[PDB]
Write a protein that holds these residues in place. Structure first.
Motif, PDB file in Angstrom:
ATOM      1  N   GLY A 130       0.796  -1.217   0.000  1.00 22.23           N
ATOM      2  CA  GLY A 130       0.000   0.000   0.000  1.00 22.23           C
ATOM      3  C   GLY A 130       0.832   1.272   0.000  1.00 22.23           C
ATOM      4  N   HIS A 131       2.149   1.160   0.201  1.00 19.75           N
ATOM      5  CA  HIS A 131       2.977   2.362   0.343  1.00 19.75           C
ATOM      6  C   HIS A 131       3.736   2.771  -0.912  1.00 19.75           C
ATOM      7  N   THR A 132       4.228   4.003  -0.912  1.00 19.74           N
ATOM      8  CA  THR A 132       5.217   4.418  -1.901  1.00 19.74           C
ATOM      9  C   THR A 132       6.535   3.748  -1.563  1.00 19.74           C
ATOM     10  N   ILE A 133       7.129   3.078  -2.543  1.00 17.59           N
ATOM     11  CA  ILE A 133       8.441   2.476  -2.331  1.00 17.59           C
ATOM     12  C   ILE A 133       9.426   3.063  -3.323  1.00 17.59           C
ATOM     13  N   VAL A 134      10.657   3.255  -2.850  1.00 14.92           N
ATOM     14  CA  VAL A 134      11.691   3.904  -3.634  1.00 14.92           C
ATOM     15  C   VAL A 134      12.861   2.965  -3.789  1.00 14.92           C
ATOM     16  N   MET A 135      13.348   2.805  -5.027  1.00 16.41           N
ATOM     17  CA  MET A 135      14.481   1.904  -5.268  1.00 16.41           C
ATOM     18  C   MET A 135      15.442   2.468  -6.289  1.00 16.41           C
ATOM     19  N   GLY A 136      16.687   2.010  -6.235  1.00 16.34           N
ATOM     20  CA  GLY A 136      17.654   2.367  -7.261  1.00 16.34           C
ATOM     21  C   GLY A 136      17.365   1.613  -8.539  1.00 16.34           C
ATOM     22  N   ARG A 137      17.861   2.134  -9.655  1.00 16.02           N
ATOM     23  CA  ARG A 137      17.629   1.485 -10.929  1.00 16.02           C
ATOM     24  C   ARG A 137      18.138   0.036 -10.930  1.00 16.02           C
ATOM     25  N   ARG A 138      19.252  -0.239 -10.311  1.00 13.08           N
ATOM     26  CA  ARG A 138      19.795  -1.575 -10.342  1.00 13.08           C
ATOM     27  C   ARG A 138      18.913  -2.529  -9.542  1.00 13.08           C
ATOM     28  N   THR A 139      18.259  -2.019  -8.523  1.00 12.87           N
ATOM     29  CA  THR A 139      17.318  -2.844  -7.774  1.00 12.87           C
ATOM     30  C   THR A 139      16.080  -3.158  -8.623  1.00 12.87           C
ATOM     31  N   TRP A 140      15.614  -2.181  -9.396  1.00 10.51           N
ATOM     32  CA  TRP A 140      14.574  -2.464 -10.374  1.00 10.51           C
ATOM     33  C   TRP A 140      15.019  -3.591 -11.306  1.00 10.51           C
ATOM     34  N   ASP A 141      16.243  -3.501 -11.827  1.00 13.32           N
ATOM     35  CA  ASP A 141      16.741  -4.537 -12.741  1.00 13.32           C
ATOM     36  C   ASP A 141      16.765  -5.895 -12.046  1.00 13.32           C
ATOM     37  N   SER A 142      17.027  -5.883 -10.742  1.00 18.02           N
ATOM     38  CA  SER A 142      17.185  -7.116  -9.970  1.00 18.02           C
ATOM     39  C   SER A 142      15.859  -7.802  -9.657  1.00 18.02           C
ATOM     40  N   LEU A 143      14.745  -7.107  -9.835  1.00 16.61           N
ATOM     41  CA  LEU A 143      13.462  -7.705  -9.431  1.00 16.61           C
ATOM     42  C   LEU A 143      13.115  -8.891 -10.317  1.00 16.61           C
ATOM     43  N   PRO A 144      12.644  -9.997  -9.699  1.00 16.24           N
ATOM     44  CA  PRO A 144      12.161 -11.108 -10.522  1.00 16.24           C
ATOM     45  C   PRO A 144      11.081 -10.587 -11.441  1.00 16.24           C
ATOM     46  N   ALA A 145      11.093 -11.006 -12.704  1.00 15.39           N
ATOM     47  CA  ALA A 145      10.113 -10.536 -13.683  1.00 15.39           C
ATOM     48  C   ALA A 145       8.677 -10.614 -13.160  1.00 15.39           C
ATOM     49  N   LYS A 146       8.377 -11.659 -12.387  1.00 12.02           N
ATOM     50  CA  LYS A 146       7.030 -11.906 -11.861  1.00 12.02           C
ATOM     51  C   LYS A 146       6.545 -10.800 -10.924  1.00 12.02           C
ATOM     52  N   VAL A 147       7.462 -10.045 -10.328  1.00 13.74           N
ATOM     53  CA  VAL A 147       7.062  -8.962  -9.431  1.00 13.74           C
ATOM     54  C   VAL A 147       7.746  -7.655  -9.808  1.00 13.74           C
ATOM     55  N   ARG A 148       7.810  -7.393 -11.105  1.00 14.84           N
ATOM     56  CA  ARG A 148       8.334  -6.119 -11.575  1.00 14.84           C
ATOM     57  C   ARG A 148       7.276  -5.460 -12.466  1.00 14.84           C
ATOM     58  N   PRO A 149       6.578  -4.409 -11.960  1.00 12.93           N
ATOM     59  CA  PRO A 149       6.781  -3.730 -10.673  1.00 12.93           C
ATOM     60  C   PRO A 149       6.288  -4.565  -9.486  1.00 12.93           C
TER      61      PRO A 149
END
Ligand SMILES: NC(=O)c1ccc[n+]([C@@H]2O[C@H](COP(=O)([O-])OP(=O)(O)OC[C@H]3O[C@@H](n4cnc5c(N)ncnc54)[C@H](OP(=O)(O)O)[C@@H]3O)[C@@H](O)[C@H]2O)c1
Ligand SMILES: CCc1nc(N)nc(N)c1OCCCOc1ccccc1CCC(=O)O
Length: 166
Positions: A44-63
């Motif tokens: 439910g919250h705003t979450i903030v991440m670095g670009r490399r962390t975005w790249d690191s997310l499993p496809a199934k939960v990106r975003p």
């Protein structure tokens, strides 16, 4: 707990006992227990991440579903479908409550603004290696409680810390 005119910044991460949080573009352990904890805190919250962390997310939960995904990058043309990309820490921290969810660089930058850290410590003795992403270092201004060790389903041990400061 948080007046709506304020800006509470919290950091949430999982670390090996050595401080390692990231390696080879990934998290070097698997811990569904921690995944669940992470979701309870951030849903439910705003979450903030670095670009490399975005790249690191499993496809199934990106975003990451159910959360407003904010990605920090200096690349104007970056494609983060389902998320928003902001070019500065300042535009990233506009919500009354924000959870900074990685990685090493962004934790390091955001810590001076933070008043909450929610930490999972995994009992795994991973030595620190060139290139690893590491957990930020908390100074004496922080305080909180350390939970008891628990075994995960696999027999990996973990415990939770809940730090804050003024
Ligand atoms: N264990 C955990 O809890 C946890 C959680 C999350 C991540 N991780 C791990 O940590 C690792 C990634 O961490 P990391 O330190 O390498 O990278 P990161 O912090 O995720 O991202 C770094 C990037 O963010 C952007 N950036 C950083 N500061 C910025 C600023 N002030 N303004 C605009 N953009 C900024 C830049 O992107 P551009 O290069 O695009 O400009 C930079 O390359 C991965 O291994 C991941 O799996 C672990
Ligand atoms: C769960 C890993 C994790 N754990 C904690 N305590 N803090 C983080 N910032 C963190 O990283 C968040 C970004 C990576 O997220 C994942 C990485 C691998 C599997 C699942 C998820 C998150 C699943 C979800 O929240 O929907």
């Amino acid at each position: 707990l948080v007046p709506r005119g304020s800006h509470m910044v919290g950091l949430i991460w999982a670390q090996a006992t050595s401080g390692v949080i990231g390696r080879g573009g990934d998290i070097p352990w698997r811990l569904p227990e921690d995944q669940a904890h992470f979701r309870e805190i951030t849903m439910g919250h705003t979450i903030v991440m670095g670009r490399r962390t975005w790249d690191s997310l499993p496809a199934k939960v990106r975003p990451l579903p159910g959360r407003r995904n904010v990605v920090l990058s200096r690349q104007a043309d970056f494609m983060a479908s389902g998320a928003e990309v902001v070019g500065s820490l300042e535009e990233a921290l506009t919500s009354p409550e924000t959870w900074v969810i990685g990685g090493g660089q962004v934790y390091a930058l955001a810590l001076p603004y933070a008043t909450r850290c929610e930490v999972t410590e995994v009992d795994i003795g991973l030595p620190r290696e060139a290139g690893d992403a590491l957990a930020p270092v908390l100074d004496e201004t922080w305080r909180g409680e350390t939970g008891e060790w628990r075994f995960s389903r696999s027999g990996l041990r973990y415990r939770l810390y809940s730090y804050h400061r003024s």
